[PDB]
Amino acid sequence: DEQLKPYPVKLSPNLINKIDEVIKGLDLPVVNLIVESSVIPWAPPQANWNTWHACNIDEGELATTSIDDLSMDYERSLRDRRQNDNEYRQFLEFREKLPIAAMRSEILTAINDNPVVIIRGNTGCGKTTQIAQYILDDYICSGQGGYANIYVTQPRRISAISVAERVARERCEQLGDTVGYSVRFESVFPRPYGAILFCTVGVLLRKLEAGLRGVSHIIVDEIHERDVNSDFLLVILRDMVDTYPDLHVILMSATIDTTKFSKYFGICPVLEVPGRAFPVQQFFLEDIIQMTDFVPSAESRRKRKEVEDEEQLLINYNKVCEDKYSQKTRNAMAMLSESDVSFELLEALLMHIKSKNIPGAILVFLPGWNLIFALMKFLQNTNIFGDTSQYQILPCHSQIPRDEQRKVFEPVPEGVTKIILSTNIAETSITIDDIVFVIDICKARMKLFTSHNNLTSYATVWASKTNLEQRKGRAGRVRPGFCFTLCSRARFQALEDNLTPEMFRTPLHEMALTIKLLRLGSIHHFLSKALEPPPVDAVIEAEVLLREMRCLDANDELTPLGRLLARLPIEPRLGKMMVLGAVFGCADLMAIMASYSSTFSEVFSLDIGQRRLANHQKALSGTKCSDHVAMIVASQMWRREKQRGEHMEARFCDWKGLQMSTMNVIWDAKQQLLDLLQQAGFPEECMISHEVDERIDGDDPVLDVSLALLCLGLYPNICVHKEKRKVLTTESKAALLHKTSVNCSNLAVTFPYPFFVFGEKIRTRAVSCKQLSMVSPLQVILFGSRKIDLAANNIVRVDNWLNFDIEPELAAKIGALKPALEDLITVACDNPSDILRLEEPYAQLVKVVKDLCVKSAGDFGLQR
Ligand SMILES: Nc1ncnc2c1ncn2[C@@H]1O[C@H](COP(=O)(O)OP(=O)(O)O)[C@@H](O)[C@H]1O
Ligand code: ALF
Ligand SMILES: [Mg+2]
């Protein structure tokens, strides 16, 4: 049965003496192995109240002024702007030509009569950009300008930011006067009365803590993606409208049978908004190879065979085609591979586009982030497509920093065709500029939750009928356009109808944390009140996981309460590891590791076609053999280069193969997490950065304890290397080390320790684990474990699949010490300002854990 050979490990007598002394000081039990609804408050607009911050103003102004005076001021200012601004006149002329204007008055009537109204219409017809302004202008011109307050919940950060900027531009002003936005890392707030605040749904859910006192309209945009946050918000607003009859809620959808939504809200009006127009032609893989005369490069086929023999060691719809097509067409179609994307095919497509000499920017729905930057660097390398003359390739996503959003959104002269590389965030979303050409690869990266309770996996899966229809409709927008769908006709015939609602394929622990943070009641009842309740077993699994490891005020009853790990914008496990790092004084390293582990961006840029990092990107990890350590060192010295001259910052980014966007994302997330810990009560003095000297070969207390807390925070992602690129994950499941990690090599390379912890598992072609870090057996025994047992021949069983050789009393001592760590977390949470001045027994526990989590602490008497 290929029994795993136990890893030899011993500790010095002084260490075990410290263990028994600390377990006697703590006096923990040892073994000889482990022992309602509050309807969020709402109130009409009231003087001396700031709606967005939910607190009384009490400042120099807005104190002795009634709402009516402000309404009169707003009305007079609006008339002045109408009668004095020519730009405003031109923008009004432009707004009066949209289809929404033809229904404008009608729309208002519904909002003035029914508390909830759904607005169904085509994307790009002017719903999010026009409805809020219509409501606000109606309220201002009606003499009630100060009585209006409009939240607009956009689905993603980039959508909210871009739509807020566009709305501000349409009113000939700047952000923060009457239109603002509030997304993660970035909040620009408008004036207290008569303003529009574009905020993402999660930001609104967090703002719900203090209540929506003073909000008159809430506009949930893009309800048809059916993400879990939108469903939470829909339930919340349903109860809010049921209790408060004066609140106005407007839901917006594009392509769905809105009958279900109408039935959900007790039969609410659904207004059908006329579709502007614009035709689109759809050509498939068959027609593409026919009119481009593509020759599938057999040399690249041999390369693909060589690079795919890996998975081969341990039904295709590309082979099916109708007889109307030529023999060469079907032969080349068969030669192509469905799973991978042929970049030579994309260059043939771009050749066809340039040959058509029809102007207009093109946009491509690339599968995923890695593929987006791979195509980025490939196109930048080519000559005809990639030079700054007549062409430029620009990426779009939510996680990219704001710096590139400005340059992609802003228009360019001479018509350089603006090749946009986007994820699926551009179908029912911002719509950017004019589009005439839509190239869809029919692939999308999705967090494919394999039901169960844990082991979050990610996979690139085929899109759906509705997504493809939306992407085809995204072609017509400035000139009749064309849609090149890169798949066979049989593949489209085999695509699923609609993608499943997100609630059925996401964990619900954060959902329940947010539910109980706002005092909404029992999780089961609240989830049963949703549109489509999630499967019950998922609810019990999430609740039992939350009732398991706690860094909160949670307990064991129907009202356990909850604080922290929910207001922290990170998964509860990583927040728990953050708090533990704040206890040990290594909060900075843990924060940056969490920021890198919660982001899908890659730390290292790989050239066009490789299997690993050749020498210099591997040199950063050095003797640690980990991506987290190399990531940390790269981030510090990148910060150094950025603090000094920007030129060498960029030059270094290119020279060591690091990505500026990735470093900026991890840096911003690290500072946000450190701040949100600061306001939680943890002093700054334990968050001082510790420089990581990778050159030191051996003992390093801060780095070793950081890897230990990583083992704690990434449970149950622990794997054992066997040979070459093969590792075993839980239940002894085979997996291959990701080619991007530093632990991958084509030579017969052996590691000092075989235990690794990995961030995510990308199932693009096979089970592949990325974000790898090698950890000693003691770290796995302490932190990266949950089940400890004694097997035959005095062999310790860890997680029922890991074999260890150790004295049973020592393993029992560590197992009893784990509840001591839990109680330390609870004590630190009780008084966050007293975490480095603890009781003497807890100080001893921290000291012994620090001395025990050392890299070389488990090699006593072993040459290794
Ligand atoms: N952030 C932006 N910057 C510049 N132009 C935009 C922006 N957002 C949308 N547009 C353009 O303005 C037009 C109005 O679209 P919009 O009403 O925002 O679409 P929807 O309301 O369906 O999201 C669109 O055709 C789009 O090309
Ligand atoms: F109004 Al939309 F996508 F339909 F922003
Ligand atoms: Mg838009």
> Which amino acid type is present at position 274?
P
Q: Is 120 in the pocket of ligand 2 (CB under 6 A)?
A: no
Same domain, 637 and 775: yes
Same domain, 776 and 836: yes
Q: Which three-class secondary structure state does DSSP give residue 817?
A: helix
In a domain, 472, yes or no: yes
Locate the ligand 2 atom nearest the alpha carbon of residue 253 and give its number: 4
Structural domains in the chain (count): 3
Domain boundary among 273, 302, 332: 273
Same domain, 226 and 293: no
Are 409 and 162 in contact, with CB atoms under 8 Å apart?
A: yes
φ, ψ dihedrals at 502, nearest 5°:
-65, -30
Burial class (CB in 10 A: 0-12, 13-18, 19+), 229: buried
> Which amino acid type is present at position 625?
C
Residue of 107, 128, 430 best suited for mutating to test ligand 2, as the one with most atoms within 8 Å of CB = 128
- Between CA 65 and CA 79 the distance in angstroms is 21
Are 686 and 692 in contact, with CB atoms under 8 Å apart?
A: no
In a domain, 569, yes or no: no
In a domain, 507, yes or no: no
Residue nearest to atom 23 of ligand 1 (CA): 124
Domain harbouring 149, CATH code: 3.40.50.300
- Between CA 286 and CA 297 the distance in angstroms is 17
Transcribe 55-79 into DSSP letters: B---SSSSSS--HHHHHHHHHHHHH
Are 23 and 802 in contact, with CB atoms under 8 Å apart?
A: no
- Between CA 756 and CA 741 the distance in angstroms is 12
The b/e string for 413-437 (b: 16+ C-beta within 10 A; e otherwise) is eeeebbbbbbbbbbbbbbbbbebbb
Same domain, 269 and 288: no
Residue-range definition of the domain harbouring residue 412: 280-502
- Nearest ligand (C-alpha, residue 129): 1
Other Cβ atoms less than 10 A from the Cβ of 833: the count is: 9
Q: Is 123 in the pocket of ligand 2 (CB under 6 A)?
A: yes
Are 747 and 781 in contact, with CB atoms under 8 Å apart?
A: no
| Closest C-alpha among 747, 772, 748 to residue 758 | 772
126 in a labelled binding site: yes
| Closest C-alpha among 68, 67, 92, 94 to residue 82 | 92
CA angle (803, 769, 801) in 5-degree steps: 15
Locate the ligand 2 atom nearest the alpha carbon of residue 159 and give its number: 5
Q: Can you give the C-alpha Rg of the chain in angstroms? A: 29
- Between CA 286 and CA 488 the distance in angstroms is 6
Residue of 161, 167, 224, 252 best suited for mutating to test ligand 2, as the one with most atoms within 8 Å of CB = 252
Locate the ligand 2 atom nearest the alpha carbon of residue 126 and give its number: 1
Q: Which two tokens stand for residue 601?
A: 């961006």
Q: Is 156 in the pocket of ligand 2 (CB under 6 A)?
A: no
Residue of 100, 125, 128, 129 best suited for mutating to test ligand 1, as the one with most atoms within 8 Å of CB = 129
Are 553 and 563 in contact, with CB atoms under 8 Å apart?
A: yes
Same domain, 259 and 327: no
For 704-813, list the strands marked E by DSSP. Answer: 718-723, 726-729, 733-737, 755-758, 761-762, 768-769, 772-774, 788-790, 795-798, 802-805
Same domain, 771 and 798: yes
**CA distances in angstroms from 418 to 293, 371, 414, 729, listed in the order given:** 25, 18, 10, 44
**CA distances in angstroms from 146 to 53, 68, 70, 140, 299, listed in the order given:** 17, 7, 6, 7, 69
**CA distances in angstroms from 180 to 176, 433, 512, listed in the order given:** 5, 22, 30
| Closest C-alpha among 850, 858, 792, 793 to residue 821 | 850
Q: Is 409 in the pocket of ligand 1 (CB under 6 A)?
A: yes
Q: Is 130 in the pocket of ligand 2 (CB under 6 A)?
A: no
Q: What is the number of alpha carbons within 13 Å of residue 253 lying toward its C-beta?
A: 23
Q: Which residues contact 534 (CB under 8 A, 6 or more apart)?
A: 503, 504, 508, 527
Strand 116-121 vs strand 270-273: parallel, antiparallel, or unpaired? parallel
Q: Is 222 in the pocket of ligand 2 (CB under 6 A)?
A: yes
- Between CA 690 and CA 669 the distance in angstroms is 18
- Between CA 595 and CA 714 the distance in angstroms is 13
Distance 800 CA to ligand 2 centre (A): 50
End-to-end CA distance of the chain: 27
Element at 633 (helix H, strand E): helix 627-643
Edge to edge, the sheet with strand 116-121 lists: 186-188, 179-183, 195-200, 149-154, 217-220, 248-253, 116-121, 270-273
Q: Is 166 in the pocket of ligand 1 (CB under 6 A)?
A: yes
109 in a labelled binding site: no
Length, in residues, of the chain: 864
Same domain, 336 and 484: yes
| Closest C-alpha among 570, 508, 730, 707 to residue 626 | 707
Are 680 and 674 in contact, with CB atoms under 8 Å apart?
A: no
> Which amino acid type is present at position 163?
V
Q: What is the number of alpha carbons within 13 Å of residue 654 lying toward its C-beta?
A: 6
Distance 429 CA to ligand 1 centre (A): 9
Element at 404 (helix H, strand E): helix 402-409
| Closest C-alpha among 727, 731, 778, 721 to residue 752 | 721
Q: Which three-class secondary structure state does DSSP give residue 842?
A: helix
Max Cα–Cα distance, the chain, nearest Å: 91
| Closest C-alpha among 350, 351, 352, 374 to residue 363 | 350
> Which amino acid type is present at position 579?
V
In a domain, 25, yes or no: yes
**CA distances in angstroms from 741 to 28, 549, 594, 606, 613, listed in the order given:** 41, 30, 17, 11, 8
Domain boundary among 220, 253, 273: 273
For residue 192, cis peptide bond before it (omega within 30 degrees of 0): no
Are 490 and 285 in contact, with CB atoms under 8 Å apart?
A: no
DSSP-derived secondary structure letter, 200: E
Q: Which two tokens stand for residue 599?
A: 């982001």
Distance 123 CA to ligand 3 centre (A): 8
Same domain, 633 and 582: yes
Q: State the sign of the Cα–Cα–Cα–Cα dihedral 637, 639, 642, 643.
A: negative
| Closest C-alpha among 810, 806, 746, 755 to residue 785 | 755
Last residue before each break in the chain (C–N > 2.5 Å): 32, 35, 314
Locate the ligand 2 atom nearest the alpha carbon of residue 125 and give its number: 1
127 in a labelled binding site: yes
Are 725 and 309 in contact, with CB atoms under 8 Å apart?
A: no
Same domain, 19 and 147: no
Residue nearest to atom 15 of ligand 1 (CA): 124
Q: Is 430 in the pocket of ligand 1 (CB under 6 A)?
A: yes
Q: State the sign of the Cα–Cα–Cα–Cα dihedral 689, 691, 694, 697.
A: negative
- Between CA 374 and CA 119 the distance in angstroms is 39
DSSP-derived secondary structure letter, 50: B
Domain boundary among 221, 253, 273: 273
Distance 808 CA to ligand 1 centre (A): 66
φ, ψ dihedrals at 610, nearest 5°:
-155, 170
Q: Is 474 in the pocket of ligand 2 (CB under 6 A)?
A: no
- Between CA 745 and CA 611 the distance in angstroms is 8
Q: Is 785 in the pocket of ligand 2 (CB under 6 A)?
A: no
Residue nearest to atom 3 of ligand 2 (CA): 428
Q: What is the number of alpha carbons within 13 Å of residue 657 lying toward its C-beta?
A: 19
Classify the phi-psi angles of 706: left when phi > 0, otherwise alpha if psi is within -120 to 50, otherwise beta.
alpha
Q: Which three-class secondary structure state does DSSP give residue 429?
A: coil
> Which amino acid type is present at position 135?
I
- Between CA 609 and CA 526 the distance in angstroms is 50
Residue nearest to atom 19 of ligand 1 (CA): 124
In a domain, 528, yes or no: no
The helices-and-strands tally (H runs, E runs) of the chain is 30, 27
Percent helix, strand and coil across the chain, each rounded to 5? Answer: 45, 15, 40
Residue nearest to atom 2 of ligand 2 (CA): 123
Q: Which residues contact 638 (CB under 8 A, 6 or more apart)?
A: 649, 652, 653, 658, 663
Residue nearest to atom 4 of ligand 2 (CA): 123
Q: Is 428 in the pocket of ligand 2 (CB under 6 A)?
A: yes
Q: State the sign of the Cα–Cα–Cα–Cα dihedral 19, 24, 26, 29.
A: positive
| Closest C-alpha among 650, 610, 598, 658 to residue 631 | 658
In a domain, 427, yes or no: yes
- Between CA 458 and CA 456 the distance in angstroms is 7
The CA dihedral of 719, 722, 726, 729, to the nearest 10 degrees, is -20
Q: Is 128 in the pocket of ligand 2 (CB under 6 A)?
A: yes
Locate the ligand 2 atom nearest the alpha carbon of residue 121 and give its number: 4
221 in a labelled binding site: yes
Residue nearest to atom 20 of ligand 1 (CA): 124
- Between CA 439 and CA 464 the distance in angstroms is 16
Are 707 and 628 in contact, with CB atoms under 8 Å apart?
A: yes
Q: What is the number of alpha carbons within 13 Å of residue 169 lying toward its C-beta?
A: 10
Q: What is the number of alpha carbons within 13 Å of residue 757 lying toward its C-beta?
A: 25
Q: Is 129 in the pocket of ligand 1 (CB under 6 A)?
A: yes
Residues with CB under 5 A from ligand 3 (ion): 430-431
Edge to edge, the sheet with strand 795-798 lists: 7-8, 802-805, 795-798, 788-790
Burial class (CB in 10 A: 0-12, 13-18, 19+), 74: buried
- Between CA 43 and CA 54 the distance in angstroms is 11
Q: Is 858 in the pocket of ligand 1 (CB under 6 A)?
A: no
Q: Which residues contact 794 (CB under 8 A, 6 or more apart)?
A: 805, 807, 808
Same domain, 767 and 656: yes
Task: Quote the distance between the C-alpha of residue 202 and its chain's center.
Answer: 12
DSSP-derived secondary structure letter, 292: H
In a domain, 79, yes or no: yes
Distance 416 CA to ligand 2 centre (A): 27
- Nearest ligand (C-alpha, residue 430): 3
Helix 587-597, helix 701-713: angle, nearest 10: 40
Residue of 118, 131, 222 best suited for mutating to test ligand 2, as the one with most atoms within 8 Å of CB = 222
Q: Which residues contact 676 (CB under 8 A, 6 or more apart)?
A: 567, 568, 569
φ, ψ dihedrals at 672, nearest 5°:
-65, -45
- Between CA 838 and CA 846 the distance in angstroms is 10
DSSP-derived secondary structure letter, 3: P
Same domain, 682 and 758: yes
Transcribe 520-571 into DSSP letters: ---HHHHHHTSSSPPPHHHHHHHHHHHHSS-SSS--SSS-----SSSSSSS-
Are 220 and 234 in contact, with CB atoms under 8 Å apart?
A: yes
Q: Which residues contact 13 (CB under 8 A, 6 or more apart)?
A: none
In a domain, 48, yes or no: no
Q: Which two tokens stand for residue 294?
A: 């593509």
Q: Which three-class secondary structure state does DSSP give residue 751?
A: coil
The b/e string for 627-637 (b: 16+ C-beta within 10 A; e otherwise) is bbbbbbbbbee
- Between CA 412 and CA 636 the distance in angstroms is 36
CA angle (376, 377, 381) in 5-degree steps: 120
Locate the ligand 1 atom nearest the alpha carbon of residue 100 and give its number: 17
Other Cβ atoms less than 10 A from the Cβ of 64: the count is: 8
Are 588 and 674 in contact, with CB atoms under 8 Å apart?
A: yes
Are 805 and 782 in contact, with CB atoms under 8 Å apart?
A: no
Q: Which residues contact 111 (CB under 8 A, 6 or more apart)?
A: 117, 135, 217, 248, 250
Locate the ligand 2 atom nearest the alpha carbon of residue 429 and give its number: 3
Contacts 24+ apart (CB under 8 A), 300-307: 300/342, 300/344, 301/335, 303/609, 304/337, 304/340, 307/611
| Closest C-alpha among 669, 735, 648, 771 to residue 370 | 771
Q: What is the resolution of this structure in A?
A: 3.5
Same domain, 369 and 444: yes
